[PDB]
Design a protein around this nucleic acid. Structure first.
Ligand SMILES: [Mg+2]
Ligand SMILES: [Mg+2]
Ligand SMILES: [Mg+2]
Ligand SMILES: [Mg+2]
Ligand SMILES: [Mg+2]
Ligand SMILES: [Mg+2]
Lengths: 338, 338
DNA sequence: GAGTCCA
DNA sequence: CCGGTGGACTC
DNA sequence: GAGTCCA
DNA sequence: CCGGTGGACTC
């Protein structure tokens, strides 16, 4: 569970355990002795807890201590089974804390979408835990999907095919001069739910925790929307970076620029909203780096130039994350006609 | 020396040793037990050798083994003196190997610069080791300075003050609207040598190795050119990356786009040549990523249309890096009147 | 299992 | 995916 | 010296 | 500054 439990750990089958001993099943060309079983770790620590939709104490706690609990639980497990032999490289803790920050934040946002969508189709406002009721007029057309995108992905594949064709034709032209314009991905996109899906229940159901089936339901969701999203209906992009270093700030900044050039410049979309979430900004003048104007915006020199990155948000608690997303939906969905 | 010598090591003062034991002198909030003494390492391994300008065997061995030699000499020193107590994090070896790849490459380019410059002023073509004599006609006005840029730096400080003035008025306008356009730095700039320095011998002396004094001379050179370079006199920008990961690609790509926007779009300079060098590209997607067109040029009625990054280069040997730079000088200096 | 690829 | 670094920078 | 920033 | 990583995909 969230608080480590000796008994609950004893109850695990060897394949569900957080530390996997691989001393006698080594990986070709790695010295790894113990693997941190990320998916096991989410199931044990967040099996019946989504932060922000759990107890008041978990919802209000320093979000860093929350995102850090899985690794801390896994090290206690490893120390119990293997004592002085237990060791893990800091680059395993780094990899796993990254994925954990992303998957858990994305799950908080998923439950916000479900509460939001439930209101929009006429079912009122679930009241535990307590959050401000949105004041925007409910409409099934204002529902949204939270898509944790896979490690490797190309966000263009979310678009209806006619929009993919406008992008393809643009690149065709660049190819004749030996140039390209590749697109990669944010960590997460929120999109307006396509009309064909506005009576499906799955988008309105809050999950109770990161059980292996809920992990898969959440991580596979993008496959359902691929091919179905209009350029204007990509409502928020999010990169997640557990901590910052000044040389790791650039991927979101570049991708945001490319998203703006293509969605706004080539497909008529309104302002693309892209933001970055971290738990440890400090040591960097990251807030200053992310004030940069869109390069596209500058190159066209239209009446209003916006930032490529709308904000660097540092969530202090899971409740805060949730409250911020609700306030964002409440404002951004005005723009979608009821 | 370049080949490890127990005897050379035995002769070193405690303060010159490649490994510095800090078990009794810990860094507050660090668990570090032994320090990799980067500057002592370069002095030991490269104190009498700049690769590409040394013996035929060093010039032509796999450059990855050339750049990995200091860390390998350090680990041999550590293992010898401390045996099984010798421990250092992979993150220590990552940091220092990145700085080795940068400093040694820069040094190879410094000697190239010096040999070019000797020819430019009419002193003929040094013959050992033998490189193809350049064909462009000599002129003191076609000498160049090789500038290994400091860790924290803003390339705009290289520019003559009237140019800095143009960038700053443009940014002042952007601030009214709550936007900025920050500049950082590539790792290295080659600039045209300013008129005032064009009969100074320091810019034509090849160094014999990376002794501490020569380390300082190379790392300090950018200071002598601050405030002196015309916008079209920044001839090449280099980003060094020892290995690649797909998330680490974006800092040079973004910066190259900012240099192009500001130098070509606001200051009238020709195409900004910016390239990346790695020893380990781990696949082919990196080459695809760097075929991206420069964003500013994609807006109708701006500067020319071309790649942000000209090329991802994987130097097989020191001699090859030397050769590529001489051939690049032979062509790009056509643009300068002699 | 072994190899490759991802970030 | 990101954290532990050697050296520079600040008082 | 003690502490922070740099990438 | 960058290397060691857990999981995904394929046979
Ligand atoms: Mg990602
Ligand atoms: Mg993702
Ligand atoms: Mg991320
Ligand atoms: Mg640098
Ligand atoms: Mg540099
Ligand atoms: Mg570099």
């Amino acid at each position: 569970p969230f608080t480590y439990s000796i008994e609950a750990t004893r109850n695990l089958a060897t394949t569900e355990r957080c530390i996997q001993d691989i001393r006698n099943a080594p990986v070709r060309n790695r010295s790894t002795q113990f693997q941190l079983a990320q998916q096991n770790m989410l199931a044990y620590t967040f099996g019946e807890v989504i932060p922000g939709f759990a107890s008041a104490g978990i919802n209000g706690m320093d979000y860093r201590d929350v995102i850090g609990r899985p690794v801390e639980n896994a090290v206690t497990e490893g120390t119990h089974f293997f004592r002085d032999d237990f060791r893990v490289d800091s680059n395993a803790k780094a990899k796993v804390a990254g994925d954990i920050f992303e998957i858990v934040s994305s799950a908080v946002m998923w439950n916000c979408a479900a509460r939001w969508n439930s209101l929009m189709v006429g079912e009122g406002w679930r009241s535990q835990p307590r959050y401000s009721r949105p004041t925007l007029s409910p409409s099934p057309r204002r529902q949204v999907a939270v898509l944790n995108l896979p490690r490797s992905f190309d966000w263009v594949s979310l678009l209806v095919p006619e929009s993919q064709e406008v992008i393809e034709e643009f690149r065709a032209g660049l190819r004749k001069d030996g140039l390209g314009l590749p697109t990669s991905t944010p960590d997460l996109a929120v999109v307006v739910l396509p009309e064909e899906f506005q009576n499906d229940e799955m988008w309105r159901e809050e999950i109770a925790g990161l059980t292996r089936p809920n992990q898969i339901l959440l991580s596979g969701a993008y496959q359902r929307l691929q091919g179905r999203v209009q350029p204007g209906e990509i409502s928020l992009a999010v990169a997640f970076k557990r901590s910052l270093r000044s040389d790791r700030l650039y991927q979101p900044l570049y991708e945001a620029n490319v998203m703006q050039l293509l969605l706004e410049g080539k497909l008529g979309a309104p302002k693309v909203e892209f933001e970055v979430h971290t738990l440890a900004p400090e040591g960097t003048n990251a807030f200053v780096t992310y004030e940069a104007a869109s390069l596209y915006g500058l190159a066209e020199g239209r009446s209003a130039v916006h930032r490529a990155i709308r904000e660097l948000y540092v969530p202090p608690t899971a409740a805060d994350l949730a409250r911020r997303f609700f306030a964002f939906l409440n404002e951004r969905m005005e723009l979608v006609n009821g």
